[PDB]
Design a protein around this ligand. Sequence first.
Ligand SMILES: [Mg+2]
Ligand SMILES: [Mg+2]
Ligand SMILES: [Mg+2]
Ligand SMILES: [Mg+2]
Ligand SMILES: [Mg+2]
Ligand SMILES: [Mg+2]
Ligand SMILES: [Mg+2]
Ligand SMILES: [Mg+2]
Ligand SMILES: [Mg+2]
Ligand SMILES: [Mg+2]
Ligand SMILES: [Mg+2]
Lengths: 62, 86, 97, 63, 190, 139, 139, 143, 55
Amino acid sequence: QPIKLARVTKVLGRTGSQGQCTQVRVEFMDDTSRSIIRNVKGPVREGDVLTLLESEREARRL
Amino acid sequence: GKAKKKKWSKGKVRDKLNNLVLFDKATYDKLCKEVPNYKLITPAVVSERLKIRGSLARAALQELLSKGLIKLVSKHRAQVIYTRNT
Amino acid sequence: IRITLTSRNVKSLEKVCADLIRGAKEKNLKVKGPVRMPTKTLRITTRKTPCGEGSKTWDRFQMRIHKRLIDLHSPSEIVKQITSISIEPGVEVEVTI
Amino acid sequence: GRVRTKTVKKAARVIIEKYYTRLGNDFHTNKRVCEEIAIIPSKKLRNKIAGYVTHLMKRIQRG
Amino acid sequence: PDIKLFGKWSTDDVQINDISLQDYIAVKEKYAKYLPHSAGRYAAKRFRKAQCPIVERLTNSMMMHGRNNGKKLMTVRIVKHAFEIIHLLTGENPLQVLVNAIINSGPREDSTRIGRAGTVRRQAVDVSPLRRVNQAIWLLCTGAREAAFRNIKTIAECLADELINAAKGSSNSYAIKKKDELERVAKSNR
Amino acid sequence: VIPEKFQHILRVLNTNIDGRRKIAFAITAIKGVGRRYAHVVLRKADIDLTKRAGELTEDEVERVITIMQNPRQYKIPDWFLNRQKDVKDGKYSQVLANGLDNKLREDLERLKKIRAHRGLRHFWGLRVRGQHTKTTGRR
Amino acid sequence: QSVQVFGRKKTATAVAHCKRGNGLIKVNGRPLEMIEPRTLQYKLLEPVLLLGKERFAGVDIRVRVKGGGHVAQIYAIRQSISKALVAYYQKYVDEASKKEIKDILIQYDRTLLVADPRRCESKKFGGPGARARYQKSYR
Amino acid sequence: PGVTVKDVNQQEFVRALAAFLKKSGKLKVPEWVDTVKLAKHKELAPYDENWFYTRAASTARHLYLRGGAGVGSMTKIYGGRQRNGVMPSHFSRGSKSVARRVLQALEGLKMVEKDQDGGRKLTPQGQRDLDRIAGQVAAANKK
Amino acid sequence: AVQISKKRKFVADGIFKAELNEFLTRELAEDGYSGVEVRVTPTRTEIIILATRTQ
RNA sequence: GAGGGACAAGUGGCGUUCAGCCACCCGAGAUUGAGCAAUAACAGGUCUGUGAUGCCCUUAGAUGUCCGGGGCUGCACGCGCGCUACACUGACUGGCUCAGCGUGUGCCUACCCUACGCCGGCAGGCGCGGGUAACCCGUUGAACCCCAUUCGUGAUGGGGAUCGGGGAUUGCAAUUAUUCCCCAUGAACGAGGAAUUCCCAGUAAGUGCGGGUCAUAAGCUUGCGUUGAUUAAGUCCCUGCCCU
Ligand SMILES: [Mg+2]
Ligand SMILES: [Mg+2]
Ligand SMILES: [Mg+2]
Ligand SMILES: [Mg+2]
Ligand SMILES: [Mg+2]
Ligand SMILES: [Mg+2]
Ligand SMILES: [Mg+2]
Ligand SMILES: [Mg+2]
Ligand SMILES: [Mg+2]
Ligand SMILES: [Mg+2]
Ligand SMILES: [Mg+2]
């Protein structure tokens, strides 16, 4: 059960019934340059380092 | 008449707990004997931990300050800051 | 000896002030400044309606009373000489010796 | 914020159509040129027309 | 030419031991200042709130609930007492344990709703580090307030106890209690 | 430094029970003694205010009760007292715990004998100075 | 050789007359050490605790304030001192040192030389404040 | 050197000024203030027994500050907040009897001079007294 | 001899203007009524009625 | 008083040549708050605004106007806007220290604003003075805040509702309404269930002052100041509206 870290490359847009999360394709620092898309609620910019708790996730909403 | 309220929250800390108005003999003796063992001489810790009121706690702290055992660091309105040297 | 120009409209105030200074420069009198008094304002708040329907919506009427003072020390003959001036009715003239 | 009125853009297009050699890239000169060549009562409208004239100059001189 | 300091402090060698909270805590030399009561005009821009010092943020979140709504002199006085209480409790510098409390006093991911207009599931998604700092300061000041509610202990005393029990992994503070309350739901809806 | 004095609970005027927090705030527990009158009686009795209620001489307690039962011998002019001129005697005096309820019952009894509307609204479950009773005064 | 620089807080104005001398800060006849809040006896000392002591010993400044609030007067004194040093280093000392000390003051804080365009808004005729409204009533 | 009451901290100044007024006995207190007098419009009486000397010292400081005040002027100088219970508060003034009392007492002890266009102002004797008391308070602070 | 404030004399003069103007548009509704102009002069108080039909 | 000054201008990216967004700097300001506000509807409210008015009733034992009382306040109850608290970030006492709008007289029909001295504890009285006003109240010495003491988790000294006695002031008249001051009696109230109101920066909230009716007179309202947050700067899920 690893705990990974991830800094933001690009920000796609805000998502939700309220528009409260944000689909963020973040990037992987501890591994090679792989690409997953995460939901990060709250304010976020390009370059925000973020603690991940599971790396086998999924882009949630279309 | 009748009593009406929209909440039910009973069971507080201790049942209208008594507290020492004036210092006793053995209690104040225990205060003076184990008070150098503490690190922060604050009136709230001295009051709640050792079954003292705030008035008698501040009175004993000023008495020991006049004795000169505990050095005052920065006294203020509600945060009395006392510390034992070494 | 001072003269107070108490005015309702600031444009006619400045016009009669420019006319008075233009008529007072050529004479051998030490003309003092037209001292700018602070503008008086009588604010009145009104219900907007005879019967109380709707939101608490209030009229806010104002005025802007302006006032200027000049100091022209002179004898009363020179004061009565300066006094005869045709003026716009938005300005009132008072003298004080 | 700069989603200015059709009459503002129309006045700026009339200025850039009639007088082109009188204008440049400096706002502080183009404003005085527009006040020599036109009559605008409102100073905010002066600044807005002259700013869009400078934007039209930066667009035309580039492409 | 002297070094910047709160009281009789130094404000040096106080470092964030990890990443994901860097450049949002203003502990460093480029954002040091004497008092928290500064020219706080940090609400116009969206992201200028991050340049605020966290001691000023703790004062601003401490002043709450109507009867204590305002009074920056009072809450800067409370934090000034609280740093001194933390220092007299076994050294262990108050700015350093405040940074440690912001690191380990709350969320890492939180539960919220997604679309589809269906079952209310409250799925746990990741939370921004800015909002982590915000909710950490909120949990710390709320725990200090309702721990010092109706006792002889002061606001500075219970705030110092809250910061010490939040920096040390002892799970005796309200910030760690609501931290657990969030990550149990996060493990449930993971 | 007053280690221990054997005094916790006193008996004043057959009904009142003195407290233990302060002397000036345990005389407050007597019905008929409020906020300022206790400090006035303390300043007339010349007792140190830092001392408790259970640290005080019984002769000085008798002196305090003497000042209670007759304040007008020494000082404390007529305005500070509770029972002012309308007595049917004109007696400027301070009420007792047993005496105050008796004087109130005499007030209400003569209001019932006059059948004044103030006494009538007190005889009913109403308010004398409660000018609005739509929402105010329920149950 | 005397420069008068002014204030400009929200409703607080500090006239600071600065002149070459031996070291003085006069706040309405009351010196630097007597700051009216005890908590803010580090924020007004920032031209002293950060810039130096020979600058203080070189320039005498007297400050008279007709402000409106306590915090407003403290920041008015702070801004008046931090602008009075800049204006005296315009009028008498060279720009090669003026620009350096001004860059030090600006990189510490913008409000040491830039005034704050913040005034309170007008109370609206519908609500109790400037943005808020009163409570509605539905069913 | 140069010592002024503006230069000296006040809560060290007035706390010794009450004692140096008790040393000289510069107080008159006829009957009602011998008995009891409360605050402005308040509940309780002031605690520490030298409060008349404290009022006289604050009167002396304020007449050093503003020359020309009087009874109602110093009453509004003191002032206060009047909590009315359920009904919200306002600004209540002080009392006039203590104001005229302290003014008459310090005039009889030669510390208040009447202004022919105004009211109280400083005497040179009271000026020397307050300046030397500020000097010895500042000396006790720097010692 | 008698005097009032500047804050009240102007509103009294304005009430005089409205009183005279609206009473003349009451009673002079026959001819064409446009408005009035009043010049404040301490020698002769001049009131000028601007009318469409001056007959 | 006039004029200047800010226009998204300058740079880089995002965008079709675009229209325009984002970060920085110079700058006081990268834009504050109000007024006015269309075409056209509601069969919204006002005849209790009038010497604005159509129709119906009355006009002498009046549905006209006065005079003397009572009444709108009246209570087993439910609802709304608000104020005070449920305390120790606090209550009490003393000291210290800062404002901004604006109001005020012999009125185009009845009238103030208040300094100074003395008396009284206070509410107040007496004599005298200034102001038709940047002049006099007034360098509006405000509250909050700051410093020191007391209180010490107790429905306690928080809360002051109810209630008795007395003393002052307006008014011709205050008791089943004035108002203010002193003493005393000292309740519920332990942070409020279902639901619901307002709010994006000098903003909410704490806190005092000024005008309106006023003689007595604010817990309402309109404006002004002091301290001054948290968190968004996004969306069509709830609600309402608009367009196609
Ligand atoms: Mg209505
Ligand atoms: Mg009553
Ligand atoms: Mg009803
Ligand atoms: Mg329309
Ligand atoms: Mg007719
Ligand atoms: Mg009828
Ligand atoms: Mg209500
Ligand atoms: Mg009248
Ligand atoms: Mg009764
Ligand atoms: Mg009310
Ligand atoms: Mg709604």
